[PDB]
Amino acid sequence: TEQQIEVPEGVTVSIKSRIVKVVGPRGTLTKNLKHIDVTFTKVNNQLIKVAVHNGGRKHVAALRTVKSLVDNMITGVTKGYKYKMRYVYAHFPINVNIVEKDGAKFIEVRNFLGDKKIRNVPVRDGVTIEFSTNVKDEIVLSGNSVEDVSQNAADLQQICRVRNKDIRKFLDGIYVSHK
RNA sequence: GUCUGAUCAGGCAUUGCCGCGAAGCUACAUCCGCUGGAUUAUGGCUGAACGCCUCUAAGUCAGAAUCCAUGCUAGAACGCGG
């Protein structure tokens, strides 16, 4: 089938082959968007329209999602999402520095479990990670994208997953709060 | 023990006669030794198939000795080539 997605006043959508751009005051975000047959390069003024002729189970998947991610990219570049995690610790005081001053496209977790060491991961695109107010448990991501924003949830969770000691007993772990 | 005439001074000979070191070599001994790339279980990330949902169909990431290259020898098919 075919679907329609509009664009408001202070946003400019521009799909140009599979390469998409959505423009907003936070940033301008690129991903790709094109499956088998389906042509999303049909800009009818405001309405960007996905259209395909064929159907089928796995085929209808890439009809909806290319429609969805342009609505999600406008919410990302305009408003900004907030994906939610928390630093948890058992006894030892888990210490964090953020992507400002010291962190030059990296975040850090030190004193995870009983580390004298450090478990380090980089960060993705133009994500303005809002850790703390004064001090908080919660770290909360926000950026210009949708994907790259919560990718800094993935970055931070996997690098210090509770592996070498058990997750069940030892409660040093930065788990997800909710999507 | 015997010969060189004898004494004597010198030789053969009995495994290097048998008793004790340093050339020449060595240990029971001396010296030395881990770079980048590709990805899996697994966990997530945006988002489906399928009004909700979730790692995959579009889209997109973190990730294992071994894998793989660093380190040393070599008939362009590898000793290049001035």
| DSSP per residue, A71-138 | HHHHHHHHT----EEEEE-SSS--EEE-TTTT-SSEEEEESSTT-SS-EEEE--SSB--EE-SSS-SE
The answer to whether the beta carbon of residue A84 comes closer than 7 angstroms to any atom of strand B is no
CA A117, CA A114: separation in Å to the nearest integer? Answer: 9
Give the nucleotide nearest to A124 (CA→C1').
Answer: B61
DSSP bridge pairs for A29: A22
The answer to whether the beta carbon of residue A77 comes closer than 7 angstroms to any atom of strand B is no
CA A118, CA A106: separation in Å to the nearest integer? Answer: 13
H or E, element range at A176 = strand A173-178
Strands A95-97 and A106-110: antiparallel
Calculate ∠ Cα A96-A128-A7, nearest 5°: 155
Nearest to A31 by CA among A42, A39, A20, A40: A20
User: What is the experimental resolution, given in Å to one decimal place?
Assistant: 8.9
Nucleotides in chain B with any atom closer than 7 Å to protein CB: 43-51, 54, 57-63
> Any residues with CB less than 8 A from the CB of A59 and at least 6 apart, and which?
A35, A36, A52
Q: Are A153 and A177 in contact (CB under 8 A)?
A: no
Residue numbers 86-115 of A with CB closer than 7 A to any atom of strand B? none
CA A77, CA A14: separation in Å to the nearest integer? Answer: 14
CA A11, CA A93: separation in Å to the nearest integer? Answer: 44
Q: Are A46 and A55 in contact (CB under 8 A)?
A: no
Nearest to A81 by CA among A128, A124, A121: A128
Determination approach: cryo-EM
CA atom of A103 to C1′ atom of B82, Å: 52
Name the DSSP class of A9.
T
> Any residues with CB less than 8 A from the CB of A93 and at least 6 apart, and which?
A111
Helix or strand or coil: residue A155? helix
